[PDB]
Structure formats: structure tokens, C-alpha cells
Amino acid sequence: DIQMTQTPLSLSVTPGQPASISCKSSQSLLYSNGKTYLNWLLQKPGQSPKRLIYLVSKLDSGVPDRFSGSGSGTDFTLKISRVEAEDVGVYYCVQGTHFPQTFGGGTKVEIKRTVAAPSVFIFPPSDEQLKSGTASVVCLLNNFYPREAKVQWKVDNALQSGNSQESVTEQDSKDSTYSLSSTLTLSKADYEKHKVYACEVTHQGLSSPVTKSFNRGE
Amino acid sequence: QVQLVQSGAEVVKPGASVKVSCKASGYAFSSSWMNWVRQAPGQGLEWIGRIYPGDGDTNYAQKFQGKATLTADKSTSTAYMELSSLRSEDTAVYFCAREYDEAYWGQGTLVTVSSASTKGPSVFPLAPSSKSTSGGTAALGCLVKDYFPEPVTVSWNSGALTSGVHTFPAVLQSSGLYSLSSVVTVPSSSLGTQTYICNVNHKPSNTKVDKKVEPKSC
């Protein structure tokens, strides 16, 4: 099987800057037919792949001229002369000359915008959930950049550990931001036992840590 | 206007088999090759095989010979795929796809091969309050907790509300059950006149839930 390797694995570039991704093949992708069969695919965060280029440099329909492919026989490169917010996603090169068709590892492209401190929101447990025995408090860090962010839970000023989970979204296709949710979960028994629940956030866009909290009373 | 629509996600005990469909339209079904591809969690994309609805001819990559059977029903333009003697490692997303002048991939089907039992999720509201209102905007959302296996799709107001929506990736809980959150940001001024409902669908367990998210106070 013709093996295909891409480079790099990840790429971070400021808007308007250029970017190139390379793919190497074990053997030549030049067929008896004068043509070399190779495509480029783009898979957005929550979508299915879409072909961008075929036959090494033929742009599909409705594909910005910012994309261009090149390469001789074992080395190919996709070039984006001007990177844009909507170009985030994972790019893959696919072989078609030999059998069976094979795919490259893929290259993740991240947009590098200006820093933006996150907006912080907190959600108290709903009555429904409380009535069912468990209680989960949610903290939302919305629309920030860069991605590394730090959140800690303080219950009645006591730093918490081991009772929360966080998830981060993929990079937004427009503002190039991220969003993160931290969920503290605990038994209804434990929830009643305390009064003030605080979410403490730290991020490169903030001078000092921000804090969002509520009193179990309300 | 080529278009491929696949069947919902499914769970299957190890050793069993599963059948995945892929309706086609907008192009001569019984005349075009229909490729099938697998996308592993962290591992890449692998070509599986292809069927030619016309004479029902089929090819396969050595790996899936005897494990995958492709069949087409030209009467409805619906190419199928059956996977035998499944293992837990066969868990993945499987796509059906065309590759002519208008390439196109189905939205993919997630097949989870697991011994664990399917469970429907519990949906709790993330209520707007003085704690989730920034400068003229308010954050609200839904908490889809304790379900198995993935995935679960979430839409707001039946798809009419998509702007400002972030549906976080699932996190695995100690209990071996998934949990995710979905949030939106809207005008603070509209909290008393607009209606916010999250539509949660979990195919594997045939669960369909609708939750209205009303504000609160703290």
C-alpha cells in the first residue's frame, strides 16, 4: 500500500499570512496514463470531507484561488497564499494512482488571532437535577484566545480538586475563538452543605484572575 | 446537486454485525461507483471498498475482505454495507462517497461496538440569570447528562437558532457515561418575549427530548 505522510501535523498562522502543507508518497503517483492522481481534502470541525483539488493542481468548483497545489512525483504541497478564519480544519492528501487509494495523516490548521479575554458565566443547578439526587454547576468561558486557560473551583473558598470536568470547543470558523465549559458535579447532599460556589479563571488576556460566583441560597 | 444521506448511529455487541445504508439522489445511481471509507478516532481515514450498482460488481482492500459486504438496491438507489464479526476496535465513523466531477460524502455513521448497554440521556436546563448576563447579552443552554454511547445531536428552536451556538464535545464520566453541554448567547432584552428550546436527539436509544429554557434569578 502506497503510504502517504504529511507535514507538519499542526500549523498556527496569523490571518493573511501564507501556509504550505506537504505530502510524500512511497512511490510515484504518475500512472501509465500521463496523469498523476492526487487530491486534497478539507474536513471542517463538524462536517464531512470535501475535495478541494484533484490531479495535483485542479481546483474544484467554487474554491477560492488562494488554494493551489503543486508537486512532481513523490513530493506535493498545498499552498494557501492568504489564510482566512474559514480555512480552519484538517487537510488531507489522497492517493489515487495505485491500489487501494490511501490517505495522508492530515494537517490541522489553526488561525492565530489577537488575544481576547474570555467572558465568564456561571449556571446554578436546575431544580430537576437536584430533585434527582445530583447537582452539577457549570462555568462557561466564552469566546477567548489563545486556548490555554485555567479554571479552578472554590466552594466556600476551599479550592476543589477531583470533582469537575472540562471540555474545549474547536476553533470558531468566524471570530477564531474558543469556548470552554467546566462542570463541577456533586451529590445533592454535598451541594446543600455549602453556601458560596465560585469559578476562578486565569488567562493571558487578563491581568488578574476573574471570579464568578453565586450563593446556594439564591 | 449530488447528495448522500446515511442512517443514524448504532450500537452493537462484540461479534455481531451491522447494516449501514446510504440513499443517493441527483445522479445516475446504477452507473456510478460508490466508495466506502472508515475514519478511526485518532487513526486516519481508510478506504474500505466499492460497489457498482449496475452489475453489482465489488472490490475491497485486502483488510476488509470477508469482513465487509457491499450490496445495492437500484430499486431505491440505496447502496448498503454490512460488517461481520465486529470487535471493539471497529468502533468508528463510516462514510459513503462519490468521486466524479462533483465529489460528495455522506455525513457518516458512527458505529460503536460495545458490550455496554444503550442508555438515554437526561436533559437539564442551564438557566439565564444575573450570573450569565454580560453587557446586553445572556447565556443559556442545556445539559445533556449520563448517556451511552455517542453521539447526541442538539439543535435550538428546531434549527431556526444557530447563531451564537456552541455545543461542547463529550466528556467521559467515571461512571462510564458521557455528558455534554450546549449553549447560546442572545439579547438580554429578549428573555421575556422569545422562546428558547433545545432539541436533543439520541438515535442509539431512540430518545427525543425538548426542553424550554426559562430565565431565573440569583
Binding site: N33, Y37, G96, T97, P100 | R98, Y100, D101
Partner: peptide, 10 residues
Amino acid sequence: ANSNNPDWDF
């Protein structure tokens, strides 16, 4: 023309 992946010709 490519016979390994016919549908790559259009």
C-alpha cells in the same frame, strides 16, 4: 486511463 480507481476520471 487509471484502472485502479476508475471513478477518478471525469
